[PDB]
């Protein structure tokens, strides 16, 4: 997160860290056994870290659970990043508490201008690299589809939306992929891609979760 703020310990209890000896992507807990992330975050040997704030210090509320299944969307395309969504099953159920809790799936799609909360442990610099120990937060609006497509001609599908700021300085960045965009208590977006971070006229692009609710529920029911 570039241009964000320190969330505060366990203020985003659905935020998880995907770990392979280092943090490499985020995710969102949607029930005690399942995490929503981005398809491009797929890799073997994932450990899901819940209840984290400082991801380099043991603070007492962590739960480390290995991923037992990883299910990319059947029509994911790694070239276009269309359908950039993935479901991770935890080897064992997480213990739900005030610091480890799920986020609701949307019942309808969000409108342009809705304010959302974007969070993650990604790079905090638009030029160079600085990775934070503690979770970072950013309040950001959903942009109109017309502005999104003007920023990224030929690249925005009906399963994507832009959020953030065209003036630069505020964005998700490397390490935030797979994590949440939450609007009115609903998981509307997944951090996916963009041209750089926090660059002028290059807002962040996000997987449009409201298009996948049926698929998410069927996948959970059958795995």
């Amino acid at each position: 997160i570039v241009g964000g703020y320190t969330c505060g310990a366990n203020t985003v209890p659905y935020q998880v860290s995907l770990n392979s000896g280092y943090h490499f992507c985020g995710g969102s807990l949607i029930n005690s056994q399942w995490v929503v992330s981005a398809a491009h975050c797929y890799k073997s040997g994932i450990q899901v870290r819940l209840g984290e704030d400082n991801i380099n210090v043991v603070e007492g509320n962590e739960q480390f659970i290995s991923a037992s299944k990883s299910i990319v969307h059947p029509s994911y395309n790694s070239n276009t990043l269309n359908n950039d969504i993935m479901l991770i099953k935890l080897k064992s159920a997480a213990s739900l508490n005030s610091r480890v809790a799920s986020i609701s799936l949307p019942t309808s799609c969000a409108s342009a201008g809705t304010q959302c909360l974007i969070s993650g442990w990604g790079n905090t610099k638009s030029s160079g690299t600085s990775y934070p120990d503690v979770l970072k937060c950013l309040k950001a609006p959903i942009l109109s589809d017309s502005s999104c497509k003007s920023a990224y001609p030929g690249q925005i599908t009906s399963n994507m939306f832009c959020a953030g700021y065209l003036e630069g300085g505020k964005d998700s960045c490397q390490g935030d992929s797979g994590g949440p965009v939450v609007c009115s208590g609903k998981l509307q977006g997944i951090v996916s891609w963009g041209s750089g971070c926090a660059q002028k006229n290059k807002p962040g692009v996000y997987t449009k979760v409201c298009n996948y609710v049926s698929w998410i529920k069927q996948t959970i029911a059958s795995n």
Binding site: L81, G122, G175
Partner: peptide, 9 residues
């Protein structure tokens, strides 16, 4: 281009 560690384009 993606916001993973490492990024993919």
């Amino acid at each position: 281009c993606t916001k993973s560690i490492p990024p993919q384009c």
